[PDB]
Ligand binder design. Structure first.
Ligand SMILES: Cc1cc2nc3c(=O)[nH]c(=O)nc-3n(C[C@H](O)[C@H](O)[C@H](O)COP(=O)(O)OP(=O)(O)OC[C@H]3O[C@@H](n4cnc5c(N)ncnc54)[C@H](O)[C@@H]3O)c2cc1C
Ligand code: PCD
Ligand code: FES
Ligand code: FES
Ligand code: FES
Ligand code: FES
Lengths: 287, 156, 797, 50, 51, 155
């Protein structure tokens, strides 16, 4: 319950936060919503000697539209995603899926940027950011750079993000009219991390699948994009056999960890099940 | 080293000096003797420490006191006005929404905010909206009735 | 004016609002961690990282040098006071601080005292301990093997324990009840015979407020005062007195507001003993408040019974005999809460609500490298296990005979006219009416239509969900009391109440029980309101302070209403008899020329001549009638003649998703009969809480250990507790079959919902697989486990 | 002084301590558990010290 | 006066009077001590609290 | 307000005080050293007596601000490691107190008087304790209490 001693820093700009990361080094950690970092510190799983609070930086906040691209500030709190009239209209998948993350209280603190940077396979945004084709803007001592969600997750708690960088914002293309989407999350109870989850974003064309993205949650050391699963639907008609083929392709890439949520056998079968459900739900949403 | 901060709790300025690692829940309970908010876990699940910070429901055991310098904090001790119970407190009382009372201060603070976010909640909305608060005694059934009671009182 | 005057009392039977609420809804309750005393220091505990091993060396220097730390104590500091080990309610001993070795992971090894909890937690991490690992024992069966490691080296050479002879070093005791020979004879020849193994998983009561205390030894006055999360403060005072050498009258134990106990706070934990010792040594208050992980990991767990049930019967479903064998996992030290003569509690109540002519049970407890416990979480002293065993067995019998599950129960029920009924195990059930109650539930949920719907779904091979109907008809045994039979560490299990009427008519009342949320401050007042004609609003009740309250045995086993409820009514009646004597003197008439009408004594035939309880109270203080002492008060210690036997009929419908294995409770109907009802609103709350706990146990809770003895899922990250979203809407019902021997006919009820709902959930899940031959499935019935079963029986998606 | 002894046989006795425990352990038939009392005294006269 | 003997032999006693220095906590204990064979030192007496 | 540092019972106390604050209230209200009492407003009773810089002083006629850099001893500081001081033992053994209101002041006075005069006669004791009033004892047992402490101090 009791976290170890640490120094608190609260710079008002991304630049100064990056500067602090540089002078303090690996002994420092960026403090966003604190709903992953504090819990780990309280259990003494992580013991940084310095915390750099980034809650007072205005450029890390806001939800705007730059043409056909939606730009969400990294410090955007989970509940603001849900209540954003822009997110609701341009990225309905994120507004609805966010309701499945933790609880109301945690959602008033945890951020979309922190959920992603934390790099926990258990988190929902990583798979969501893949299906939605998001791009993350990072700022370090050498300026900024934009990286895609697909390929951003390297290992458990490991991302493309460098020790001296700060994720500024999340850019994602608005949904085309008639875009189908869905997030299926199997969980033991409300506010728990998924036993298995699948994020799907797709577009239709008559009775065929014209565009498709499928991502898997908590069934490997990182979030997974089911490319072969997409390959079983792209340009093909939407049939029952096609969906199962995709499910089998999703299942084949699963590498779940055995824990209290179930064994590899269960999690894999469930990943497939969440895929089937997500695809049918996503298809039903297409116009 | 202790940081000097002033946090507004229940509309009153609280000038103190605390180490950066001081959790808001201990600050309220230990420094100000506002012992209504409780601790029921170390993993952020129970919500017994729920207080209203700057217009939002927050689990004070997962928030630093030093991040509240200048903030507006509301605790169960500040719900009643001039002795008259808030609709939320009256609801829990009339509907028997509490037994041991341990999860109560957290439930009240959450319901206080929830009813502003959603003035006319359905049962499903209530259960889901109160989902971050655990209770060992009630079985929640009367708690949803209590919230329904308060929702009704606020509209009249 | 008669009906109105009774209504204004808000006494017996009224659903009056709680007197307790006011303080709790405004954050003015007073729980152990709210307490702050002058000079109060904080204590934290250094715990064992391994499950079994020798303690090579403990390093105190780094912790002691740390600013803010006042002391670091180990078993060495406890030895001179003979406190490194302490006696338990089960007649065994438990380590206060690990001496030569550790018996379970997270066990108390050392303690630090610091200026506050932050420094204290730091101090714990500074203390380094070196260990020599020893082979772990996690399975009870493996524990009794010849080559199995010796866990309890402290009792090496002992051939007997507190409950009879011991056959193996890891064997604690073997207890049995019923007629063995007679039972074996029935089973040897019975035409129908069924057998079923079932595991009742180790779970935790997990009260929202954890255990803690503020111990304060005052070297100036020489007395000890300790505020504590105890469900039996008086017993703790006696025990603390004898272990410390401090005269009992100078020891004051006080249970303030407790955020739930659920049997988890009946016993004395090493944390309390350490705080007391540190306080004595430092001459100042010491506060100890455990974190959730410590509570789930080291305090009293529940269940952990490996059971083998058997039923003998004739082809029409009439039960001829019952035979049970159980292996009990009690952990490292046997600290199981129970009356000294029942190492397996009241498990012999497993004959249930049925007239079974021959029965026998046998329980064998064994040691393992785990935390002590066994009795807690609304078990009524192993009744949970007893009810689960019989109800599961009856379902097994019904399935072998292809007989309806409700029908087979109505066939074996003890008939209403058979009460008071003496079971095959020797219990004398006070009263009951099971047939009427069952019919009520079946009609309420349209049972035949449910079976019809179930038959239809089973017909279609492609129905996406499995339908299961679970039914439980149970009988509880609550009110642990007959002193000749029940005692806690030698103290007869009676209880008490003391009432004092003030000159103006209001009053103060104190009992030997202690509420943890069940509403005593309201209900107790209601009992007295009706007995004395004084509104319950002005009858102030208190519990928990050993210096003010009459001696009692505390609150657990749903004993408050049966035992204390009786003491309360009798104490009030002692006052009522004196009030009559006084009223007769004032009215200048003979005592039995007087009639009691709600709140006054009136002269028969003359309604205008009367005296109210207020009039009488004043007279008692003003001028006592000749031959009477001034004042108006009474005290009463009740030693119950028998337990109380409430019952219930529970029905649950579940729908299982064949693709995911997740179970959805469609409906849950619960009928409870606890005799005369004091406050229906309060009863309903206890039922909701109980049913919710049952859902928690049957559907998600468990405490798994890996091969190394590490406790897995010991925090809310994995230890299941339902939120409002997971908890189904409860439907409650009732009938009123009073206890003939009880002063007001009221029976306990609080544990009933927990005891009965659990096997009801298993019954529903198993019934969903019954059509493919499934006779039983071990809890918890999580999606994962239920899916493994769907897979195993080719029912998956 | 502090015990009840059987007339004649001095070795047969019970202290108030023994009696107190018995009162809590198992009360003799017809008696309530515990060992306590209350008394309100209405004096017959004043006292006259000199 | 109300006297309650504990399981282990010691006791607590309360009276309707209230000392203001006259030594009731010592003297009252002595009366009871002779009446019950319990040393006055462990017979704890209190007064003044109407509750 | 003046910031002062007073050594009370061996511990340094840095506090901000208003000039008009009587030492007796500073001890009782700020430090919660409620042993010292108040029995008058004219400086006669001596129930507020404490030892300041080696001398007995009625704390109700001394300002807290004047104690900057002083050594103050109150009755709570007499016992050493829980072992009573000779004067505390003498008063207890000789029944030198009843209501206990004048006791802390009597003890603080006796503590210093016995250092001023280790072998006092009864007359010297009565005169040496003249600044302290008692309403309960009649002083006789107090004289014996001080005599008992005198013998123990030279033991
Ligand atoms: C009870 C509970 C349940 C939860 N359930 C879920 C759930 O179901 N699904 C889910 O997805 N999550 C869940 N979470 C986690 C919340 O959703 C995680 O809150 C948040 O993962 C980590 O985000 P944060 O904003 O709180 O940041 P923090 O806790 O501060 O963690 C931030 C981490 O990422 C780094 N970081 C943060 N922001 C940035 C940035 N802008 N740039 C660079 N690095 C940064 C930090 O240094 C650190 O490593 C739960 C948390 C709790 C306590
Ligand atoms: N008939 C009748 C009965 C009863 N009632 C009521 O109701 C309640 C209850 O009661 P009872 O039943 O008697 O019981 P009690 O004793 O009181 O209690 C106890 C229990 O209770 C339960 N519940 C609860 N709740 C709460 N809130 N909290 C708690 O803690 C708890 N815990 C749990 C447990 S576990 Mo043990 O210990 O394992 O044995 S036992 C137990 C009370 O108030 C009473 O009065 C009435 O009214 N009527
Ligand atoms: S103490 Fe449990 S969520 Fe805060
Ligand atoms: S009322 Fe006790 S935990 Fe909610
Ligand atoms: S109060 Fe009387 S002399 Fe100080
Ligand atoms: S003992 Fe009372 S004034 Fe001295």
């Amino acid at each position: 319950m009791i976290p170890p001693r640490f120094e608190y820093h609260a710079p008002k700009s991304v630049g100064e936060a990056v500067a602090l990361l540089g002078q303090l080094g690996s002994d420092a950690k960026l403090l966003a919503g604190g709903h992953s970092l504090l819990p780990m510190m309280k259990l003494r799983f992580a013991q940084p000697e310095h915390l750099i609070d980034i809650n007072r930086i205005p450029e890390l906040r806001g939800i705007r539209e730059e043409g056909s691209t939606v730009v969400i500030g990294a410090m955007t709190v989970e509940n603001d995603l849900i209540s954003s009239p822009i997110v609701q209209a341009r990225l309905p998948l994120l507004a609805e899926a966010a309701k499945l993350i933790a609880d109301p209280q945690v959602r008033n603190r945890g951020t979309i940027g922190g959920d992603i940077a934390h790099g926990d396979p258990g988190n929902d945004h990583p798979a969501l950011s893949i299906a939605v084709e998001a791009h993350f803007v990072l700022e370090g001592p050498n300026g900024r750079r934009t990286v895609p969600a697909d390929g951003f997750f390297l290992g458990t708690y490991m991302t493309l993000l460098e020790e001296n960088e700060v994720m500024v914002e999340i850019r994602v293309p608005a949904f085309a009219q008639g875009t189908g989407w869905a997030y299926e999350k199997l969980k033991r109870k409300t506010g728990d991390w998924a036993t298995a989850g699948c994020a799907v974003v797709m577009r239709k064309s008559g009775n065929t699948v014209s565009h498709i993205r499928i991502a898997l949650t908590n069934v490997a050391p990182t979030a997974l994009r089911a490319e072969a699963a997409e390959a079983a639907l792209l340009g093909k008609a939407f049939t029952k056999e096609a969906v199962q083929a995709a499910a089998d392709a999703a299942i084949a890439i699963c590498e779940p960890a055995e824990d209290l949520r179930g064994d590899a056998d269960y999690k894999t079968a469930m990943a497939g099940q969440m895929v089937k459900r997500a695809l049918n739900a996503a298809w039903a949403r297409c116009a | 080293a202790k940081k000097i901060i002033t946090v507004n709790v229940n509309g009153k300025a609280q000038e103190k000096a605390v180490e950066p690692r001081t959790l808001l829940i201990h600050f309220l309970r230990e420094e100000l003797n506002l012992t209504g908010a409780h601790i029921g876990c170390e993993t952020s699940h129970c919500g017994a420490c729920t207080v209203d910070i700057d217009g939002r429901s927050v689990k004070s055991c997962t928030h630093l006191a030093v991040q509240c310098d200048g903030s507006e904090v509301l605790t169960v001790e500040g719900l009643a006005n001039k002795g008259v119970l808030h609709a939320v407190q009256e609801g829990f009382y009339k509907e028997h929404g509490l037994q041991c009372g341990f999860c109560t201060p957290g439930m009240l603070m959450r319901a206080y905010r929830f009813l502003q976010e959603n003035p006319n909640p359905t049962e499903a909305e209530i259960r889901m909206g109160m989902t971050g608060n655990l209770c060992r005694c009630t079985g929640y059934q009367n708690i949803v009735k209590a919230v329904q009671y308060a929702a009704r009182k606020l509209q009249e | 004016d008669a009906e109105a005057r009774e209504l204004a009392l808000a006494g017996m039977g009224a659903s009056r609002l709680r007197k307790e609420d006011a303080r709790f809804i405004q954050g003015k309750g007073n729980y152990v961690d709210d307490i702050k005393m002058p000079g109060m220091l904080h204590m934290d505990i250094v715990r064992a990282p391994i499950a079994h091993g020798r303690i090579k060396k403990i390093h105190k220097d780094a912790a002691l040098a740390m600013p803010g730390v006042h002391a670091v104590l180990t078993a060495e500091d406890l030895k001179p006071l003979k406190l490194h080990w302490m006696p338990t309610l089960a007649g065994d001993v438990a380590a206060v601080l690990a001496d030569e070795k550790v018996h379970f992971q997270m066990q108390e090894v050392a303690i630090v005292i610091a200026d506050d909890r932050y420094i204290a937690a730091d101090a714990v991490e500074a203390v380094k301990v070196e260990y020599d690992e020893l082979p772990v024992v996690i399975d009870p069966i493996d524990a009794l093997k010849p080559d199995a490691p010796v866990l309890r080296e402290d009792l090496a050479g002992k051939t007997s324990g507190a409950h009879g002879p011991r056959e193996h070093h890891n064997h604690i005791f073997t207890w049995g009840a019923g007629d063995k020979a007679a039972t074996d004879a029935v089973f040897a020849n019975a035409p129908v015979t069924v057998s079923q193994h079932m595991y009742y998983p180790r779970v935790h009561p997990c009260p929202l407020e954890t255990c803690g205390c503020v111990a304060s030894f005052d070297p100036i006055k020489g007395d000890l005062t300790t505020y504590i999360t105890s469900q039996a403060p008086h017993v703790v005072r006696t025990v603390v007195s004898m272990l410390s050498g401090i005269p009992e009258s100078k020891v004051r134990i006080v249970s303030p507001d407790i955020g739930g106990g659920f049997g988890n706070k009946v016993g004395i934990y090493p944390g309390y003993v350490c705080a007391i010792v540190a306080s004595i040594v430092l001459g100042r208050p010491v506060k100890w408040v455990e974190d959730r992980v410590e509570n789930i990991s080291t305090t009293a767990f529940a269940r952990d019974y490996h059971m083998d049930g058997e039923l003998a019967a004739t082809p029409d479903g009439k039960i001829l005999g019952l035979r049970v064998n159980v292996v009990a996992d009690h952990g490292a030290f046997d600290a199981c809460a129970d009356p000294t003569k029942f190492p397996a509690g009241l498990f012999h109540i497993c004959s249930g609500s049925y007239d079974i002519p021959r029965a026998h049970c046998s329980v064998k407890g064994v040691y393992t490298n785990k935390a002590p416990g066994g009795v807690a979480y609304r078990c009524s002293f192993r009744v949970t296990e007893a009810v689960y065993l019989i109800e599961r067995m009856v379902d097994v019998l019904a399935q072998k005979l292809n007989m309806d599950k409700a029908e087979i129960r109505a066939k074996n029920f003890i008939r209403k006219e058979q009460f008071p009924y003496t079971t095959q195990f020797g219990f004398e059930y006070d009263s009951g009416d099971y047939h009427t109650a069952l019919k009520k539930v079946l009609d309420a949920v349209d049972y035949p239509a449910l079976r019809a719907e179930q038959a239809a779904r089973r017909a279609d091979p492609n129905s996406p969900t499995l339908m299961g109907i679970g039914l439980v008809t149970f009988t509880e045994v609550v009110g642990a009391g007959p002193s000749k039979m029940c005692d806690i560490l030698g103290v007869g299990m009676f209880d008490s109440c003391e009432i004092r009427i003030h000159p103006t008519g209001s009053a103060i009342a104190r009992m030997g029980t202690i509420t943890q949320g069940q509403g005593h401050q309201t209900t107790y007042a209601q009992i007295i309101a009706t007995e004395l004609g004084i509104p319950s609003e002005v009858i102030q009740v208190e519990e928990g302070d050993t210096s003010t309250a009459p001696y009692g045995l505390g609150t657990y086993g749903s004993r408050s209403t049966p035992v204390a409820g009786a003491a309360i009514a009798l104490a009030a009646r002692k006052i009522h008899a004196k009030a009559r004597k006084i009223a007769a003197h004032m009215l200048e008439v003979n005592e039995n020329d007087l009639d009691w009408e709600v709140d006054r004594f009136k002269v028969k035939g003359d309604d205008s001549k009367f005296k109210t309880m207020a009039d009488i109270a004043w007279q008692a203080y003003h001028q006592p009638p000749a031959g009477l002492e001034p004042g108006l008060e009474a005290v009463h210690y009740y030693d119950p003649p028998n337990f109380t036997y409430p019952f219930g009929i529970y029905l649950c419908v579940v729908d299982i998703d064949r693709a995911t294995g997740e179970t959805k409770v469609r409906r849950f109907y619960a009928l409870d009969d606890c005799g005369t009802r004091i406050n229906p609103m309060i009863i309903e709350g206890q039922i909701h809480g109980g049913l919710t706990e049952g859902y928690a146990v049957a559907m998600g809770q468990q405490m798994p250990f890996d091969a190394q003895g590490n406790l897995l899922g010991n925090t809310l990250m994995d230890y299941f507790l339902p939120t409002a979203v997971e908890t189904p809407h409860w439907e409650t019902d009732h009938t009123v079959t009073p206890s003939p021997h009880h002063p007001i006919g009221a029976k306990g009820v609080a544990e009933s919902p927990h005891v009965g709902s659990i096997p009801t959930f298993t019954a529903a899940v198993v019934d969903a697989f019954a059509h493919v031959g499934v006779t039983h499935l071990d809890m918890p019935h999580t999606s994962y486990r239920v899916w493994k079963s769907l897979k195993e029986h080719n029912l998956a998606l």
